[PDB]
Design a protein around this nucleic acid. Sequence first.
RNA 1: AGAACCUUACCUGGUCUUGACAUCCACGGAAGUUUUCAGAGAUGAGAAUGUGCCUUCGGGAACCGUGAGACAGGUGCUGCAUGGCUGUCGUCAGCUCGUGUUGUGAAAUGUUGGGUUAAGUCCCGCAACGAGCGCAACCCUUAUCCUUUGUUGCCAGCGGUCCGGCCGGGAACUCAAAGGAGACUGCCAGUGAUAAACUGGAGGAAGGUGGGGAUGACGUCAAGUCAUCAUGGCCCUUACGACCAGGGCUACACACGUGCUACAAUGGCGCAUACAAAGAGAAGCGACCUCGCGAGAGCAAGCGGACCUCAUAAAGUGCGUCGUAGUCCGGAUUGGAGUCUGCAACUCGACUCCAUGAAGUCGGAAUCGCUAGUAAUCGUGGAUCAGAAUGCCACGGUGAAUACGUUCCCGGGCCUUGUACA
Lengths: 96, 206, 74, 98
Amino acid sequence: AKQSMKAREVKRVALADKYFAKRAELKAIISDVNARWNAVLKLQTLPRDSSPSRQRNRCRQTGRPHGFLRKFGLSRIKVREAAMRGEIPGLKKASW
Amino acid sequence: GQKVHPNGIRLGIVKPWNSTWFANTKEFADNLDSDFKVRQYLTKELAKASVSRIVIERPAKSIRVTIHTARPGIVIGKKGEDVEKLRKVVADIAGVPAQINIAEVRKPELDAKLVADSITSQLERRVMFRRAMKRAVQNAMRLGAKGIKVEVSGRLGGAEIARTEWYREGRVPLHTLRADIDYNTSEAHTTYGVIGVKVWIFKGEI
Amino acid sequence: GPFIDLHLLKKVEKAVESGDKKPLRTWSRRSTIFPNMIGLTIAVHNGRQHVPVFVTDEMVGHKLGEFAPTRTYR
Amino acid sequence: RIRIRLKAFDHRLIDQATAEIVETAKRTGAQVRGPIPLPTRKERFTVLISPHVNKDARDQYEIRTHLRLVDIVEPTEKTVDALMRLDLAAGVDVQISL
RNA sequence: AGAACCUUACCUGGUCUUGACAUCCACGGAAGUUUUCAGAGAUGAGAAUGUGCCUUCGGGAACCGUGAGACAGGUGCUGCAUGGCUGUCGUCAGCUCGUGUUGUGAAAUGUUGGGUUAAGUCCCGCAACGAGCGCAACCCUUAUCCUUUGUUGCCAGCGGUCCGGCCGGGAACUCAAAGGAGACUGCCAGUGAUAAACUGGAGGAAGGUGGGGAUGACGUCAAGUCAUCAUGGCCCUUACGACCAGGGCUACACACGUGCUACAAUGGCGCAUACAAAGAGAAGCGACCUCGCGAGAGCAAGCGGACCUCAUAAAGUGCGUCGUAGUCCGGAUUGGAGUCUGCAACUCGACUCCAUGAAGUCGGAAUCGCUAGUAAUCGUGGAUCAGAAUGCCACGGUGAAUACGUUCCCGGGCCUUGUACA
């Protein structure tokens, strides 16, 4: 899982919306087609380390990146093993 | 090698869900999130307490933690040891202001984990498997349990490239779906080698 | 306006504001070249080295880091 | 205009969501349009198996959640007031529409 | 089941060393909140700012902060150490045991004959009786009914109709989900030992396991994942580490493993009839609108989802164009307008107005693939998703060519021959 990414998990997930849930509303008119200035562009990237397009949607309970799922919040082999332990409600093998 | 998990095919069949909550889209991943941190944690105290299953439903902002056991006299503690203490966990780290429901299923040498984890408890004791298997097969043959299938994984005795085991017995019709198999693998951490165990138990046709 | 970044707008305001001088090892290479950047030198980080570009006024549709790329072919 | 919505995985759990209401919450004072689960929201996921290349999984799972659109129109003072205390039984949420 | 960063496992510019983060205690600061400053951002000059809560005011919850340490950390090595998971032989029909006796035994008989089946499927003869694993059926599905009961969806019948189920009404046509039938070679005739099996008949929507899914025995394969966790054993620990800016994994100068577009008895065109299922949605779908030359800007109801949005479309027709010509087939190559996205694309984002008009006239040796809504040939969504579908995963329409056979080859196996080969 690259176990040191579980350090860098919260470091790249938490402050993304703890900085850009409200500060994006603070500049939501200017670069949009409503009028264009560089003070908002100076406001845009005077830091760098906040990014809401850095979250790769790592898996939940063991953290494997590839094979992640939208609805389940789990990845390739963990969707399987939770469905085999019955941890997921109402989920049989698909057949029709 | 070449199998399916005998629970995973049969949850859509008359074998019921051992956990069944319901929610909707956004919280659909955060609810079984909460259901995992209790299932990794109830093992950590109820290990010697003959743990069988953990059942969770969500009626209304609460979970009915329906613990199934077979040795409940050590589960309760000093008659109040594990009433609110094991509701203290679910309130924040699961986020669920819930209740607790402990309940015994009898026959403490017939459930899947129990037949599994006893042999581990006998291999953590490190008795001979050749004396352990041959009796612990027939504990199921004692109390009913119409069929058994127990494979002990390798690194057993003195070897580094080892073999598998069987004691097939009675009838284990797991390839036919209508056979409600109480299956649960366990793992025994003897020093050299991960000596695992696979236990198939057939509890009657339906 | 045109694509400039504060990672080099804290460099090009330390380059153009005091005339023509020693260069800036510019980490932010992806910018768009102002018309008062002619003659000035603003480098391009290729991964190791802030390799510079001889700025020409034809770099309107053209951009900065072409003359200073990362990779070499023969 | 008491419009009842329940979402459930099973049919064998949502079918006894109407036995709670047809008798104990309806005698005359609930003009029952019907327990009608009409659509289904099926969600299929052909996720892999092996922790490597497999080129054909043959693993897929499904859910068949049902949607009872129960629109009773009789806000009585007898039938529909023994009704606000009902969340039976397993995984039951409300989307009552007024 | 997806690369500007992240992922990154890769490289450095910058660097952070009790750390990113946790066990563990110390000692203060409530945490936290605004802002200058300087940087490429970390880091850092920091000031401000507050001092809430438990508080029986000693202490603290809990982090902010270092000092100090056990030592946090390593997508790091052999699946040839093993756990779990997994490719394949293989939907092949195979694989062994308890009793029984032949034999001094190793071992056979059970498993071998008559045939018959998709089949150790089944019957007559069985030197056997017996069972368990496996093929079967249990199951999802649709090919056709009744009952269920009228929303957000329908109008047979009856009408108000401002033809729109629009409005009564009717649960009806039909659509939409709960839950029953029926199919068993059943029936007869014939085959065959009179055996099962089967050849025809009748019936129906359905007949010779209705059909597809789903389901992979003992196992041989030092094969898959020690980089997902796990992991016997080895290891770099001011580091097969950590911590930030940033670059590449997209150079081709091309061999080939698999695909789509072509090379045209209809393509650049413009035109008008016709109608699908499958489904997609509040960090939304996004209409009515207005608008963009297209790309796209503003207006954005409604639906929170058979309401609303997404989105009703294709070959099919009514019409000519145009003559199998490298163009009027084809589509390339080189350049730049107008916005969209994302801080972030020039290197390494696509869609798009206009001119640009290559290679290619079906591709040698040959190869791979497929038995009915079938190879194909055109429509339609889903995910990985800030924005990257030719594909991937699923649904609609039109509708083929046919099957002598085991000669050879592949892939086998079983029943019976000979070797000084473990």
